[PDB]
Scaffold this active site. Structure first.
Site, PDB file in Angstrom:
ATOM      1  N   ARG A  91       4.983   2.961   1.466  1.00  0.00           N
ATOM      2  CA  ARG A  91       6.421   3.125   2.163  1.00  0.00           C
ATOM      3  C   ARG A  91       6.733   4.110   2.951  1.00  0.00           C
ATOM      4  O   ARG A  91       6.506   5.421   2.368  1.00  0.00           O
ATOM      5  CB  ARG A  91       7.243   3.014   0.802  1.00  0.00           C
ATOM      6  CG  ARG A  91       8.922   2.822   1.282  1.00  0.00           C
ATOM      7  CD  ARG A  91       9.284   1.522   1.196  1.00  0.00           C
ATOM      8  NE  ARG A  91      10.892   1.152   1.451  1.00  0.00           N
ATOM      9  CZ  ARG A  91      11.152  -0.052   2.024  1.00  0.00           C
ATOM     10  NH1 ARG A  91      10.538  -1.017   2.198  1.00  0.00           N
ATOM     11  NH2 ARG A  91      12.481   0.089   2.534  1.00  0.00           N
TER      12      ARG A  91
ATOM     13  N   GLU B 113       6.834  -0.456   6.204  1.00  0.00           N
ATOM     14  CA  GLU B 113       6.221  -0.967   4.889  1.00  0.00           C
ATOM     15  C   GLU B 113       4.962  -1.341   5.395  1.00  0.00           C
ATOM     16  O   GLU B 113       4.528  -2.091   6.362  1.00  0.00           O
ATOM     17  CB  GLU B 113       7.296  -1.901   4.400  1.00  0.00           C
ATOM     18  CG  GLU B 113       7.652  -2.798   5.304  1.00  0.00           C
ATOM     19  CD  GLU B 113       9.210  -3.736   4.660  1.00  0.00           C
ATOM     20  OE1 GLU B 113       9.665  -3.318   3.614  1.00  0.00           O
ATOM     21  OE2 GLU B 113       9.481  -4.726   5.548  1.00  0.00           O
ATOM     22  N   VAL B 114       3.906  -1.047   4.549  1.00  0.00           N
ATOM     23  CA  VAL B 114       2.417  -1.210   4.949  1.00  0.00           C
ATOM     24  C   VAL B 114       1.842  -2.081   3.710  1.00  0.00           C
ATOM     25  O   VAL B 114       1.958  -1.588   2.509  1.00  0.00           O
ATOM     26  CB  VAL B 114       1.821   0.211   5.048  1.00  0.00           C
ATOM     27  CG1 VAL B 114       0.338  -0.146   5.403  1.00  0.00           C
ATOM     28  CG2 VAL B 114       2.287   0.778   6.290  1.00  0.00           C
TER      29      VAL B 114
ATOM     30  N   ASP C  98       2.604  14.018  15.096  1.00  0.00           N
ATOM     31  CA  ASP C  98       2.741  13.676  13.610  1.00  0.00           C
ATOM     32  C   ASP C  98       1.534  13.776  12.835  1.00  0.00           C
ATOM     33  O   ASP C  98       1.005  13.011  12.051  1.00  0.00           O
ATOM     34  CB  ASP C  98       3.272  12.545  13.327  1.00  0.00           C
ATOM     35  CG  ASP C  98       4.205  12.210  12.034  1.00  0.00           C
ATOM     36  OD1 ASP C  98       4.569  13.422  11.640  1.00  0.00           O
ATOM     37  OD2 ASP C  98       4.284  11.033  11.425  1.00  0.00           O
TER      38      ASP C  98
ATOM     39  N   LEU D 146       0.859  -1.328  -0.140  1.00  0.00           N
ATOM     40  CA  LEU D 146       0.024  -0.068  -0.095  1.00  0.00           C
ATOM     41  C   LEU D 146       0.671   1.412   0.061  1.00  0.00           C
ATOM     42  O   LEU D 146       0.791   1.951  -0.819  1.00  0.00           O
ATOM     43  CB  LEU D 146      -0.972   0.000   1.155  1.00  0.00           C
ATOM     44  CG  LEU D 146      -1.974  -1.335   1.377  1.00  0.00           C
ATOM     45  CD1 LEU D 146      -2.895  -0.978   2.498  1.00  0.00           C
ATOM     46  CD2 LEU D 146      -2.736  -1.297   0.031  1.00  0.00           C
TER      47      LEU D 146
END
Ligand code: NL2
Ligand code: CL
Ligand code: CL
Ligand code: CL
Ligand code: CL
Ligand code: CL
Ligand code: NA
EC number: 2.7.11.1
Length: 333
Positions: free
Chosen positions: A46, A51-52, A155, A44
């Site tokens: 980076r 990593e996703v 964030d 999906l």
């Protein structure tokens, strides 16, 4: 003499009044599951630390998201896990479903309940006035919740807001930089993306609090109502404060530096110059005028302050006239 100390105006002592184990993430014991319970479907995104992937839970055929934690301090992994566990079930908070390790590589991964990989940055430059108010109110629910639970996200940015526009659903994601708020704690200022960094980070004032997230939220609001991405477009962390000073003005900046007895990096001495505080009308034009109202500008002005103590809290923000019609439509439904 050193910097003047600071305390959060709200939720100051909530972690003190909890059991140690609520916030003592270094002591948290993680039961690591088996990543072989999942099959990865596709990559999906980076990130710096992750990593996703879209994945399937074999057991029930339910879609999930897997975030494989790129090599990083074990302390930081326990912090993100503990925060996600503490916030699980909160409004517009992503739901941690499982914690697993790859049997071979021993790499840790987090498993989340599925959300579409449509981040807010993709949609937030195309919204109606009403939808900006609606989705800002949804982000505030998540921030008031995590702040009330003794946590600051640190964030907040469009890339960390996932939105299902069809179902008008929002989730605040990527809790990897989040921390527990403890009165008198000095925090790392190397957090948040450049364009969303509050002045406290840029001048190295370490005793900050939940109000950091409210600066970041104001940067998102300004971007959306003015169709200016990003709103404060610095070349680097020093120029970022110059971009802010050209809008908010230098008088309030130097008053803030005097108030907290902040030792300003010598680099700043020649680049900040002297700037008036600009009226928000200067950013209004024929393409964005439909998103700008007196209510929007009054609200924005009360998020974007140098002095973190001056900024609206998340709950004060939710009370602002900018949201009256959203609050009325919510009660109606
Ligand atoms: Br769901 C979900 C998606 C992404 Br991208 C994330 N990054 N960090 N946590 C996440 C949770
Ligand atoms: Cl509109
Ligand atoms: Cl972003
Ligand atoms: Cl920190
Ligand atoms: Cl700028
Ligand atoms: Cl002006
Ligand atoms: Na207008």
């Amino acid at each position: 003499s050193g910097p003047v100390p600071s305390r959060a105006r709200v939720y100051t002592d909530v972690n003190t009044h909890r059991p140690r184990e609520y916030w003592d993430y270094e002591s948290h014991v993680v039961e690591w599951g088996n990543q072989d319970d999942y099959q990865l479907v596709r990559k999906l995104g980076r990130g710096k630390y992750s990593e996703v992937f879209e994945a399937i839970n074999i057991t029930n055929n339910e879609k999930v998201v897997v975030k494989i934690l790129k090599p990083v301090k074990k302390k930081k992994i326990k912090r993100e896990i503990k925060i996600l566990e503490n916030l699980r079930g909160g409004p517009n908070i992503i739901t941690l479903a499982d914690i697993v390790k790859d049997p071979v590589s021993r790499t840790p991964a987090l498993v989340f309940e599925h959300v579409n990989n449509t981040d807010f940055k993709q949609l937030y430059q195309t919204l109606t006035d009403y939808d900006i108010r609606f989705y800002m109110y949804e982000i505030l629910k998540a921030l008031d919740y995590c702040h009330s639970m003794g946590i600051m996200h640190r964030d907040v940015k469009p890339h960390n807001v996932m939105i299902d526009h069809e179902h008008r659903k929002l989730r605040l994601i990527d809790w990897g930089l989040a921390e527990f708020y403890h009165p008198g704690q000095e925090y790392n200022v190397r957090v948040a993306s450049r364009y969303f960094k509050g002045p406290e980070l840029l001048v190295d004032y370490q005793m900050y609090d939940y109000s950091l997230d409210m600066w970041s939220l104001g940067c998102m609001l300004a971007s959306m109502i003015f169709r200016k991405e990003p709103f404060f477009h610095g070349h680097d962390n020093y120029d970022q404060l110059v971009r802010i000073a050209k809008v908010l003005g230098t008088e309030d900046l130097y008053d803030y530096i005097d108030k907290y007895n902040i030792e300003l990096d010598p680099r700043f001495n020649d680049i900040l110059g002297r700037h008036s505080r600009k009226r928000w009308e200067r950013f209004v034009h024929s393409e964005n005028q439909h998103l700008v109202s007196p209510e929007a500008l009054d609200f924005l002005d009360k998020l974007l302050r140098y002095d973190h103590q001056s900024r609206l809290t998340a709950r004060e923000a939710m009370e602002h006239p900018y949201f009256y019609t959203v609050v009325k439509d919510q009660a109606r439904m």
